[PDB]
Amino acid sequence: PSHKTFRIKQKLAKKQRQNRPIPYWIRMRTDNTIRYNAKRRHWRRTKLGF
Template sequence: MSKNKPLGRKLRLARALKSNSPVPAWVIIKTNGKFRYNFHRRDWRRNDLKV
């Protein structure tokens, strides 16, 4: 991907990057283990972004 990219694509990539984090430990404790795993986790090699 080029270094210079449109702002819209850059914002979508930033949003995808932020939403790719695991569930915090305090959330697992607070929900008594109901939310253990982030189902929206994405691996850069296995999954493709529709950006």
């Protein structure tokens, strides 16, 4: 809602910083196995439950 608490606004902010594709240079490091962000979230597909 537009009326929210600071604590809920704080957690929603962090969830946004985590919806980003991995940097390209991570894919180049020695002995690397990360392919993609396996935790990306879409607001219409998976709800935060908080």
